[PDB]
Amino acid sequence: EQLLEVVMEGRELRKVAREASNVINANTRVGDVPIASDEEFARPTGQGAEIRDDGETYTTVAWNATKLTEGSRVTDEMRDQAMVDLIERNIQRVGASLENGINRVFLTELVDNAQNNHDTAGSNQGYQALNSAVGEVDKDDFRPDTYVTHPDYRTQLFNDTNLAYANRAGTNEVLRNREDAPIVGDIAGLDMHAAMSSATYDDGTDIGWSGGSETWGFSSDGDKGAVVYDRDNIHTILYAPNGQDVEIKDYEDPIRDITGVNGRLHVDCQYSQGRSSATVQY
């Protein structure tokens, strides 16, 4: 006789920020991105008149990367008697909790600080909403290339007959493979789809976090369910003292027969140009 030496996994959240934004590996926890002023129009003037100067001017987007941390501690008796490697399992949980943290920092900047909005007002929430939101960014003379999406928005979108009927979509891929269909990442001039999890956005209900301004969702009047944006104009800034990325320490308490694992990373997320982004609203 031997036990079922297995553990069933819990829910695992979608991790995309590191692909769905410009990642800066910063040399310092605090820093600046220089921004140039917008284009203008040359002045009409008379012959012999002085050329009036109206040169480039500059400003910065500052970053202040905040340390996200997660950890655990177990007695050595528990390590020795565990059904599976508790240190390996806690290392995985710590790594996952930091990556989830990055995705929360990213999505909360992305959703709160987009400078344009398409209010669907119920109604035409499928392809027409994505096209409309591209139109909102296009009116500010940027162009988007990516969209970030809530599960309820995805569900609405894949019910749209324009995508669900193979003749209207040009392929049956959405009907067959749903979000894994290549057209879902090649729609309305956008060349990337970044599927998010529902829990990712900062509601301020989770401990240690103070909420964003919006509601992430797509089921009730006023929810923001997708963001259409320029991937080059949203920055995720990662800082680490001892390398480039997430650092996990495995340690023993010096005196108490306790072992633990602790993870850290510093992260900030900032728009370069918030005008390059539009939310879609229910």
């Binding site: 036990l3 553990v7 655990s72 177990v74 008796e77 059904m83």
Partner: protein, 82 residues
């Protein structure tokens, strides 16, 4: 921090499985108080084990007072009609 006895950790403990199996194999009834110590009931969460006597081998074993045919120790769940 989580100790070996802490409530969130019990399912990871090899002993928690082994002694719950031991308790199932050793009971005659679901009535824990008559069979197990308060220590055993708390440490191994025996309320939540499906203890009832149905997994004790001795529930099924012949234990006759006069045994002419040398037949004591036979287990009924090994008969051909089972």
């Amino acid at each position: 921090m989580q100790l070996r006895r802490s409530p969130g950790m019990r399912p990871m403990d090899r002993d928690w499985h082994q002694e719950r199996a031991r308790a199932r194999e050793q009971a005659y009834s679901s009535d824990l108080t008559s069979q197990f110590s308060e220590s055993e009931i708390v440490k191994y969460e025996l309320d939540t084990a499906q203890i009832d006597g149905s997994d004790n081998p001795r529930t099924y074993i012949w234990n006759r007072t006069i045994d002419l045919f040398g037949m004591n120790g036979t287990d009924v769940r090994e008969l051909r009609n089972r």
